[PDB]
């Protein structure tokens, strides 16, 4: 315990690669190039403690559902068990996104290169969660219609692969003057609108919100935007600098919202499965 001893430092003495939020004035971990010191810091208080734990807790719970739901006892309750792949893809995305997020935050203070590597993973993780969310959702909403479903899926994956590849850029390019990573990110959010409305027109507006729960499900899209808008704005830190150094920062609320939103997606999505069994087609 007398190894890798460290103390919290103010924002001013931080290196540029650790300077990512000027509204967090104190409680920053000093750069420590040790994974042992980085993982041991999880059980200590600093600017990133909240971010670690929120997605660390989110990971375990989403991990349970993935495995618990995957070992469904009522395999008989599932028709035709082909459906497990659809749910599984979602869980991988949620689990990977969640695992990458807590890892990046923990190893954030290690070194500039390590921070860079894990940062790319965090970005890739978000794209995976979005990709994962669509497969279960698209499958059931277009359960009756195979041709529209296959087509919607290809777009998301192409846009999704594009997102991960653009963000990681391990193979080629960046950093660049170009803001194209944003274009691919734009693809993910936007691709969702064509399917969602398509579902409403085909099933009717009234039936889709009430039964499809799309309107009730509308909250999730709102939540993600709230989180995205909130994090960029950096509220409430912007309004009260130095008052949100350790708790209730924008990033942790955003981190919390991702779990709440992914869960809401799951509850809403599960209801869609019940809708499908009732009606073969119409």
């Amino acid at each position, epitope marked *: 315990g007398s190894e890798g001893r460290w103390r919290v430092i103010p924002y001013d003495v931080l290196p540029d690669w650790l300077k990512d939020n000027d509204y967090l004035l104190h409680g920053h971990r000093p*750069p*420590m190039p*040790s994974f042992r010191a980085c993982f041991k810091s999880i059980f200590r208080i600093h600017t990133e403690t909240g971010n670690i734990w929120t997605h660390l807790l989110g990971f375990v719970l989403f991990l349970f559902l993935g495995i618990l739901t995957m070992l469904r006892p009522n395999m008989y309750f599932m028709a035709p068990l082909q459906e497990k792949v659809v749910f599984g893809m979602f869980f991988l995305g949620a689990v990977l996104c969640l695992s990458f997020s807590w890892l990046f935050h923990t190893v954030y203070c290690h070194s500039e290169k390590v921070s860079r590597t894990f940062s790319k993973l965090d970005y890739s993780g978000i794209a995976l969660l979005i990709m994962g969310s669509f497969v279960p959702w698209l499958y059931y909403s277009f359960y009756c219609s195979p041709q529209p479903r296959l087509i919607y899926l290809s777009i998301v994956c192409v846009l999704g692969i594009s997102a991960i590849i653009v963000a990681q850029w391990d193979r080629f390019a960046t950093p660049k003057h170009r803001q194209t990573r944003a274009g691919v990110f734009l693809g993910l959010g936007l691709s969702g609108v064509v399917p969602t409305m398509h579902f409403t027109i085909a099933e009717g507006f009234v039936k889709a919100t009430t039964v499809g729960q799309m309107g009730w499900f509308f909250l999730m899209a709102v939540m993600y935007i709230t989180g995205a808008g909130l994090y960029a704005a950096r509220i409430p830190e912007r309004f009260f600098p130095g008052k949100f150094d350790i708790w209730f920062q924008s990033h942790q609320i955003f981190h919390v919202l991702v779990v709440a939103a992914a869960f809401v997606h799951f509850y809403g999505v599960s209801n869609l499965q019940e809708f499908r069994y009732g009606l073969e087609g119409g």
Partner: antibody
Amino acid sequence: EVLLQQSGPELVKPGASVRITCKASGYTFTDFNMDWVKQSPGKSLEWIGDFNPNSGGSIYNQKFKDKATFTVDKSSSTAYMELRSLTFEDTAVYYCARETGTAWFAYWGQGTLVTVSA
Amino acid sequence: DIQMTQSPASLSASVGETVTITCRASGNIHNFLAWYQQKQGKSPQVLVYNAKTLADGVPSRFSGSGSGTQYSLKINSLQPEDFGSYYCQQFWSTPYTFGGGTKLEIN
């Protein structure tokens, strides 16, 4: 910028005790730990130990356990080190070094020369 | 207590030449190492910290490399003011220790 200022040269008799002063300016004094270093003439640096302004908690090298005691004045933003039962072996230049989260010293005092003569 | 062994005891080079100073630790110090330069009769100044991080305001000629028990300080395009004593220290474990030091001469 950050400045660490030390007291003047000290000439003392064996068995005497001396106090070294480190004056810290240009930064929040309580923000970082303060360390003390001893360099015997024509010799390498030795780590006496560290002191925490915030916790008033200090660690000493086994070699300097009884020899040195660290005290601090928060109002004056000044750190002190006390050397007792001075011996011949203690004739060295003494520095105060400020760490930055980890014990790497960006800032150093000019140093204090403690000369012990019979 | 970690023991820091510095190599060599002393060395010399001409202006513009490259010199490498090596430091070896008794145990793994996990990249918690710093390099200092001390001019005669003056307090030491930090060059590199955290094994490979250059301190602010330090000339680009100074660089750090290594992991575990072995670390190196490399000086490119040697300068007249670079003469002095160079030290390495480990802040990974208590008590914090310093290398014997390396004396540098410029021709």
